[PDB]
C-alpha cells in the first residue's frame, strides 16, 4: 500500500536495565472486509496482518493482527533496555508489502 508511514515514539536513551514505553503507529486504511459499496457488495479485506518490534534483534512483541484492529494501527508496549543498539519495527501487509522503521537507543 502507498503512504504507509511509520510513526514511533520511544526515548533515544535509557539507564541500562530500565523499562521504556514504546508507541508504534502506521497509516493504513485497514480495509476490514465488512464494508459495503454503494451497491451493497462487500469490499474485500486488505490489512496489516502482523507487527513485530525487536530490540537488538530479540523480540519485544509480535502481534498477529485481525480486521478488528482499527485504521492506522497503534501498538503500545514496554521494552527492557539492557544494552544499546536499535529497535526494529516491521509491519506485514496482506498485499505483500513490508514496512520498516529503525530507531536508535543509547544507554546512559
Amino acid at each position: 500500500a502507498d503512504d504507509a508511514k511509520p510513526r514511533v515514539k520511544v526515548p533515544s536513551s535509557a539507564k541500562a536495565g530500565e523499562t521504556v514505553t514504546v508507541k508504534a503507529l502506521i497509516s493504513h486504511k485497514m480495509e476490514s472486509g465488512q464494508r459495503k459499496d454503494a451497491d451493497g457488495k462487500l469490499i474485500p479485506r486488505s490489512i496489516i496482518n502482523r507487527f513485530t518490534c525487536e530490540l537488538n534483534g530479540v523480540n519485544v512483541v509480535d502481534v498477529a493482527i485481525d480486521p478488528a484492529v482499527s485504521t492506522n494501527p497503534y501498538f503500545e508496549f514496554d521494552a527492557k533496555v539492557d544494552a544499546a543498539g536499535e529497535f526494529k519495527f516491521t509491519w506485514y501487509d496482506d498485499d505483500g508489502s513490508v514496512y520498516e522503521d529503525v530507531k536508535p537507543i543509547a544507554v546512559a
Binding site: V58, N59, V61, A68, V69, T71, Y74, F75, F77
Partner: protein, 113 residues
C-alpha cells in the same frame, strides 16, 4: 461450536480458563466503535489474545511477548460493530490460561458500512 469457543479452545489446548492474573481495560461506553482503546496486562504471560464476541469475525489480535519485553502490557485501538463483550485470554509459560471479560457499550458501530 461458536467461533469464540473454537478460538478459545485452540488457545487453551482444552483447559478451562482460570481467573485472576489478567487486567482488561476498556471504556464502559465507546462513543466511536471505529476506534475503541483497549489495554491488557497479564504479568508473566507469554501471550494475550483479544476477542470481540459480537463482531462478525471475533478474533481481534494476539500479543506474543518476547524476551525483550519489560512487562506484559499492550495497548491498541479496535473496532466494535455493536455493544458487546470483549474477552481477554492470557496464557502463562506453564500453559495455564486466564480469562477476563467486560461489556462495552457502543454508540457508533465500527467494522464498516
Amino acid at each position: 461450536s461458536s467461533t469464540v469457543d473454537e478460538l478459545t479452545a485452540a488457545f487453551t489446548g482444552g483447559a478451562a480458563t482460570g481467573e485472576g492474573g489478567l487486567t482488561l481495560t476498556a471504556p464502559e461506553i465507546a462513543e466511536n466503535g471505529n476506534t475503541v482503546p483497549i489495554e491488557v496486562k497479564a504479568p508473566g504471560a507469554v501471550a494475550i489474545m483479544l476477542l470481540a464476541a459480537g463482531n462478525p469475525e471475533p478474533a481481534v489480535a494476539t500479543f506474543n511477548f518476547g524476551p525483550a519485553a519489560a512487562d506484559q502490557r499492550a495497548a491498541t485501538r479496535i473496532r466494535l460493530a455493536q455493544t458487546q463483550d470483549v474477552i481477554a485470554l492470557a496464557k502463562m509459560a506453564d500453559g495455564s490460561v486466564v480469562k477476563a471479560q467486560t461489556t462495552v457499550k457502543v454508540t457508533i458501530g465500527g467494522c464498516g458500512g
